[PDB]
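Field notebook, page 281. I keep forgetting to write these up properly, so this time I am using the form the group agreed on. The chain and the ligand, G1I, are recorded exactly as supplied. Prediction of the bound pose follows.
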Amino acid sequence: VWVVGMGIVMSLIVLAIVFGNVLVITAIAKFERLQTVTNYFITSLACADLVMGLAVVPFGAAHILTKTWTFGNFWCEFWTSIDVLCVTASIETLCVIAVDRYFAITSPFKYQSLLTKNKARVIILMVWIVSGLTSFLPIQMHWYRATHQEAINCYAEETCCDFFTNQAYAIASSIVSFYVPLVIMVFVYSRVFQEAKRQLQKIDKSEGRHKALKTLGIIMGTFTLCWLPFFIVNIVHVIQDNLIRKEVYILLNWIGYVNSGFNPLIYCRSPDFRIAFQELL
Ligand SMILES: CN[C@@H]1CCc2c(ccc(O)c2O)[C@H]1O
């Protein structure tokens, strides 16, 4: 009496995720003043989020509400590979943006020489290649498959799709996709905040006659709150099988996806972007 009609809540996520990234891409591409070395990371992240909005969410919604995977097994493997690829690419692009901000702030004179039109292409291509080798190579080769009887029963039957993964693959994927970027971004942002505080003290020293905390809080909190809860259960549920149920795992995984829709609000607030949005509509 309430399961069927509540498809609007899942459809709104798809609509918002598509719309935000579409506007970001259109604003960057069509408008002359928005093209900058930093903006290429933004457009790569926007494309990665658009792939999630167009591929993984619509099929997952059907698989959940219908409780039956109508399609075959090849599409199941392909969809899982797409999911892993997009997630890791998005997180590593966030890490790349953070490191670029660190270089921009800490070394003002020599920022120009390090990043240019040439280096952005190479770094983006290497990030996407690293993301691709994590997902497609182990999943498609069938090297990640489990061993217990339940996994065999699930993988033999075509109509059932569930994620059963070996301990080593889970640990390796979690480490390569989440923790290293988290440590890098934490160190970078702490250093940047310390620099900002030092500059504020320096100016107050002579001009005698908050904002950084708020910005850092938003940037760190949205990412950590959206995804950290997932990888914790991802690592725990393989070490000891009795603890974590499947429903909790699914809920945390779907909570992680919503972070894709919040990226345009977090990373696109410049007055130039506002002018571009106003001109489009
Ligand atoms: C079913 N969805 C997948 C399952 C496991 C997994 C995800 C994302 C990144 C990873 O490194 C993973 O191992 C999830 O999005």
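OBSERVATIONS:
- The radius of gyration is 21 Å.
- Residues 83-84, 87, 163, 173-174, 177, 253 surround G1I (CB under 6 Å).
FOLLOW-UP: compare against the apo run.
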